[model samples]
Target: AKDPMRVLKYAILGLLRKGELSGYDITSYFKEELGQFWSAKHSQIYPELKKLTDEGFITFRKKMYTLTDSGKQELHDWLIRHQPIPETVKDEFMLKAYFISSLSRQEASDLFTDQLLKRKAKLSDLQGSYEKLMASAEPMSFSSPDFGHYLVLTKALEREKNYVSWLESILAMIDED
Candidate 1:
């Protein structure tokens, strides 16, 4: 029987490409910054680890989990491989903005002010995550997993800036009475 790759399995391979992760570290990674962007159950990770090692894509010990050459290869394949366009879930702002016209201008303005504060908070949070990357190890070659981590946060941080600008612009346009 063949087990096809799931997105979560690919995440494990990608993460292990960086360095050692105990079952503990992997779950913690998700529980920390990784959880911000994607969803994975702690329940799902251990069982998937079993499936990965059983299939020879990785090996684990009482101490940790590391990738096989095949796992690394698959990680690369998943990274550069072409495919169908992925899906996107709408942001909270996306949904909230949709019916704002129904509100009094003041109501919508207050709502957006709340969103602005929260979005700025998220940018601060992301900045903390980025700062810690510099706080961690390895000079960062293109091949190292941190390279991807670096740029992924790049998008999140810079993307935050653009989003902040949008909110500021919308806030100005809301035009209080």
Candidate 2:
């Protein structure tokens, strides 16, 4: 799992690329900016940090962590490489749709309707977070390279909106004879 999916390590290195940080700082960061697209628990983070440190890719000093020259190169290599995204996806909700025929019409409709409401609430929460982040003292800017973070959130918003539309369409068909 670690070799094939080094996303967590890449994420940590990406943060280190900016500057030094404590393990706590890295964990906190994962909760904020990185949380938009990537996920890592402190349990997962500490071990990876140790492994990276052992590999001489990063260094620990004065209770903080910074990337080594090799670490920077590794990150640069990853960024420079082009990787294709897998077309296969495993969505539990969509999987449920495959089995939806087993349930009664109202049950199926209820499931999709519930998802619609949840998606709307999710969009609201994401939008609110975006607004607050924008109003912060050091607000995220469009000009910054990290502006990609906001772009990902916007994509999430668009995805939820599309899900809501698709779910409504499904619901409409479910009620018909």
Best by lDDT: 2
List the candidate 2 regions with Cα displacement exceeding 4 Å: 1-6, 136-142
What is candidate 1's lDDT per residue for 5-110, written digit by digit as tens? 3547887887788677898888888887677776686677787888888889899765699999888887888889899988986787778799887889889889
Best by TM-score: 2
RMSD of 2: 2.6
Give per-model CA RMSD.
3.4, 2.6
Candidate 2 weakest ten by summed lDDT = 1-10
lDDT tens readout by residue for model 2, 61-128: 84799999999999999989998987977889999999987999889988998998998899898888
